[PDB]
Amino acid sequence: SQLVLILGDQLSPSIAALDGVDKKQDTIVLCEVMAEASYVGHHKKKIAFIFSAMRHFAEELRGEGYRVRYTRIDDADNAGSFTGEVKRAIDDLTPSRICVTEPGEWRVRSEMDGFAGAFGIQVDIRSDRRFLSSHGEFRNWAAGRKSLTMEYFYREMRRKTGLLMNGEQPVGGRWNFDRPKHPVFAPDKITKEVIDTVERLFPDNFGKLENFGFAVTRTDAERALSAFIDDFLCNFGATQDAMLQDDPNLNHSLLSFYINCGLLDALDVCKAAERAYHEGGAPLNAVEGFIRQIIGWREYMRGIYWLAGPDYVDSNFFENDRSLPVFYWTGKTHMNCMAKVITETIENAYAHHIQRLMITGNFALLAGIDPKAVHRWYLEVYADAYEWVELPNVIGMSQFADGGFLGTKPFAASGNYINRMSDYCDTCRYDPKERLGDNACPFNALYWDFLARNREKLKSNHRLAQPYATWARMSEDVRHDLRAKAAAFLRKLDAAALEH
Numbered sequence: 172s173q174l175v176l177i178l179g180d181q182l183s184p185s186i187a188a189l190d191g192v193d194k195k196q197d198t199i200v201l202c203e204v205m206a207e208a209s210y211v212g213h214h215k216k217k218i219a220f221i222f223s224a225m226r227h228f229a230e231e232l233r234g235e236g237y238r239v240r241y242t243r244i245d246d247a248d249n250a251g252s253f254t255g256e257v258k259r260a261i262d263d264l265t266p267s268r269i270c271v272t273e274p275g276e277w278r279v280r281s282e283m284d285g286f287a288g289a290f291g292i293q294v295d296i297r298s299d300r301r302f303l304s305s306h307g308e309f310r311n312w313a314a315g316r317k318s319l320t321m322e323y324f325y326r327e328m329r330r331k332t333g334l335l336m337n338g339e340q341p342v343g344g345r346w347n348f349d350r351p352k353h354p355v356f357a358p359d360k361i362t363k364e365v366i367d368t369v370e371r372l373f374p375d376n377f378g379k380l381e382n383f384g385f386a387v388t389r390t391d392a393e394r395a396l397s398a399f400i401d402d403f404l405c406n407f408g409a410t411q412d413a414m415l416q417d418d419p420n421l422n423h424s425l426l427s428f429y430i431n432c433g434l435l436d437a438l439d440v441c442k443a444a445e446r447a448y449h450e451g452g453a454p455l456n457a458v459e460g461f462i463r464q465i466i467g468w469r470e471y472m473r474g475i476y477w478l479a480g481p482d483y484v485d486s487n488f489f490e491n492d493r494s495l496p497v498f499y500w501t502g503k504t505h506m507n508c509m510a511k512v513i514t515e516t517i518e519n520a521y522a523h524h525i526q527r528l529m530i531t532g533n534f535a536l537l538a539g540i541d542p543k544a545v546h547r548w549y550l551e552v553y554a555d556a557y558e559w560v561e562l563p564n565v566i567g568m569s570q571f572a573d574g575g576f577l578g579t580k581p582f583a584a585s586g587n588y589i590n591r592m593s594d595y596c597d598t599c600r601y602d603p604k605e606r607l608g609d610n611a612c613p614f615n616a617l618y619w620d621f622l623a624r625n626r627e628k629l630k631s632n633h634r635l636a637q638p639y640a641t642w643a644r645m646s647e648d649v650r651h652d653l654r655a656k657a658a659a660f661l662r663k664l665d666a667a668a669l670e671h
């Protein structure tokens with residue numbers, strides 16, 4: 172007999188751990204355990220989504236003739252951790268070996284590495300076939316290459332998969348090329364019970380549970396993918412970086428949550444976009460861009476995470492110590508852009524790429540926040556957030572706390588960028604055209620202060636040469652007044668964070 176452990180982000184009937192299962196003899200284990208629901212203060216909607224999808228996935232496996240041992244969060248006898256439930260199901264089932272698909276967190280991986288010793292039974296940890304590249308392949312692609320960039324990896328993924336390839340050439344001669352309501356799925360009985368249970372057990376957690384609309388079945392997630400292809404995929408590249416106060420979704424797909432937990436397969440999503448391309452329903456730039464986000468960025472981020480090692484989380488290139496601002500938890504800031512995106516995050520457990528990078532992340536970058544505080548908040552607030560995908564985006568891409576290890580440039584931008592790409596300023600109490608004075612957008616002074624105080628470390632970064640040139644053309648008193656303006660704003664933040 173076999174004990175097949177399946178984690179909350181492994182909700183696919185093709186997950187590796189299921190290869191070679193004897194439906195008559197083996198038992199699948201799913202457990203809602205407190206260790207996983209509390210290692211960070213997850214968004215209420217995140218906990219609700221995961222538990223619901225784990226429950227529906229349990230029912231689905233039972234529906235496919237699998238034997239499933241489920242453990243709910245408020246079940247008594249619940250041992251509170253993966254290992255504990257592993258003990259219970261062992262004693263229970265006296266199985267011949269444990270089978271599990273490798274996880275997406277160093278924390279969980281390490282626990283699971285402890286199984287073979289803890290139980291004195293052979294543990295079979297299987298490589299997660301949901302990723303195009305294994306750890307060894309990513310290591311070997313990166314080995315020797317004195318600079319990591321997503322692009323090169325992406326091209327190797329394009330060749331590997333055959334997506335948008337005309338044999339050995341990229342479709343359209345080049346690898347690279349840079350509204351209706353979104354679907355809502357009404358909570359069924361299971362989901363409503365979960366929502367109630369979560370609100371009961373995690374009432375102080377970040378976020379609201381009101382208007383939960385997530386797909387929690389494979390079918391509904393496939394319906395969200397289909398709705399994306401039909402309604403938004405055609406305009407996906409045309410608005411990738413735009414923000415709108417009245418529209419939190421725009422042409423984004425909102426599929427990450429399903430992809431990241433096994434309700435959708437990344438490769439199938441790409442094939443959907445490609446199929447749409449050939450049938451004429453989307454331009455090549457939008458479909459290439461879309462796919463590049465999945466077999467490029469997503470795959471590359473996972474590779475970076477496992478390559479950098481667990482202490483990657485400690486990266487602090489600029490040696491920041493400042494605590495996270497209080498308004499990331501409350502959204503009560505006069506900065507309209509930050510108030511909108513944070514409020515959306517509180518309400519919806521979602522924000523699109525450019526929001527995470529250029530509003531809340533950009534702010535945290537310019538403000539010199541302890542990178543670890545930033546990683547923590549990103550991992551908690553979004554229902555697509557797991558350390559393998561969140562951490563490289565935060566440490567590497569947004570915060571540059573790894574010093575550019577993953578090839579990106581510093582994404583520091585002023586109120587000029589945000590005014591240019593959004594309509595948040597239109598109703599903000601701050602003036603983004605003003606950099607000094609009490610009405611000045613905080614991002615202007617903060618942008619220059621960031622560049623100034625980190626000048627030694629960013630001196631030789633070609634991308635910032637124009638800004639430094641401009642810095643150097645300002646009178647000394649202008650540079651002084653800007654830095655002081657920044658310091659006064661940071662003061663206000665540090666003061667607010669003292670009440671703690």
Ligand SMILES: Cc1cc2nc3c(=O)[nH]c(=O)nc-3n(C[C@H](O)[C@H](O)[C@H](O)COP(=O)(O)OP(=O)(O)OC[C@H]3O[C@@H](n4cnc5c(N)ncnc54)[C@H](O)[C@@H]3O)c2cc1C
Nearest residue numbers: 423424425426427464468469523524527528555556561564
């Ligand atoms: C600070 C920060 C934190 C982030 N944290 C996460 C996270 O915890 N989980 C997560 O899945 N994504 C994360 N991203 C990437 C990106 O913001 C989200 O994947 C995207 O907003 C998800 O919504 P969507 O599915 O509508 O994306 P779309 O705009 O529809 O893009 C298509 C798909 O590509 C993938 N994708 C796009 N960009 C990235 C990226 N930078 N890294 C990895 N995959 C990407 C997603 O699977 C996404 O569903 C983060 C980015 C930043 C700057």
Ligand SMILES: Cc1nc2c(=O)[nH]c(=O)nc-2n(C[C@H](O)[C@H](O)[C@H](O)CO)c1C
Nearest residue numbers: 178179180202203204207208274275276
């Ligand atoms: C909140 C939460 N709860 C559970 C759970 O009860 N059971 C489970 O298997 N997984 C959960 N997850 C996902 C995991 O904690 C972890 O992030 C993934 O296993 C990473 O591979 C999360 C994020």
Ligand code: SF4
Nearest residue numbers: 508586589596599612
């Ligand atoms: S003005 Fe500065 S703060 Fe007010 S919204 Fe535009 S950018 Fe955000």
